[PDB]
Amino acid sequence: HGSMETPPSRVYGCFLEGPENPKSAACKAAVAAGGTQALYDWNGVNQGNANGNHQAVVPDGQLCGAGKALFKGLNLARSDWPSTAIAPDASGNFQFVYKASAPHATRYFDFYITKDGYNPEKPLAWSDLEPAPFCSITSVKLENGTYRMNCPLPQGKTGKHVIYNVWQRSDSPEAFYACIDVSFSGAVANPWQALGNLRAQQDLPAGATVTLRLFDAQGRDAQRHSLTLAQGANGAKQWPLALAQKVNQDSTLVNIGVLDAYGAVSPVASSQDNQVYVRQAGYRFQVDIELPVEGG
Ligand SMILES: [N+]
Ligand SMILES: [N+]
Ligand SMILES: [N+]
């Protein structure tokens, strides 16, 4: 039993946050979806009778949850799942650190990687992953409750990806699954660039709708994201964050919030401090406001 800690699997992550008080939107939406109980049984994302035929026992659309109704909340298709940014060493490899709360005999440690062009918003299916694993570990030694394996990192990848780790025990027929959300650096520097400030002059009436349009370098419609503000989200120090959360969730092309040293953009409960970032130049954005229809 266990999962990856370096990098953190999607389940280890949500849990290091604090199941009883999630911090990231994805994790909040995960506990609201499948309960807090799954986040504690974080070691049992498994299939007792895989026998090496994971493709026949893990249903499409529930890979992150091994089709276990308990972990239903892990299969959410979102663009904001917290993710580790990874890169190779001087030789192109990556040292994975798997945490085994119960060291059992090992058959293999297979690493799958989403195809080029993976779309976070489509629930992870087997065919969204590349056909054969990019790294196959066949013997390990324990070291302070973790299995450490050097792996050749796939080259040419770019953007947010999911590494799918399968651990097939040798002593029994069961295996464990780990959706690791990673993020690759392209062949060209892709630093988040700020475009404007998602500023709020005064509060908006409850039920009004707030729309953010994004235009590319050629003034073409790039993306659109709308959000009707329920009571309590219409505050001036509230709605800019409410919109910045709907944006980050549905999109990886534009992110609204605060940039940190690592390179991540997380919003804030601020009236002015929320910023609109895009990984290309010359982009522009507009904020439109539909007011609640009046009349009988
Ligand atoms: N077990
Ligand atoms: N691919
Ligand atoms: N959504």
Residue numbers in the entry: 1 to 296
What does the paper say about this structure?
CbpD has recently been shown to be a lytic polysaccharide monooxygenase active on chitin and to contribute substantially to virulence.
All LPMOs have the Glu (sometimes Gln) which is required for enzymatic activity, likely by coordinating H2O2 and reactive oxygen species intermediates. The maintenance of the polar interaction between the side chains and the proximity of Glu174 to the active site imply that Glu174/Asn46 may also gate the access of cosubstrates or electron donors to the active site when CbpD is bound to crystalline chitin.
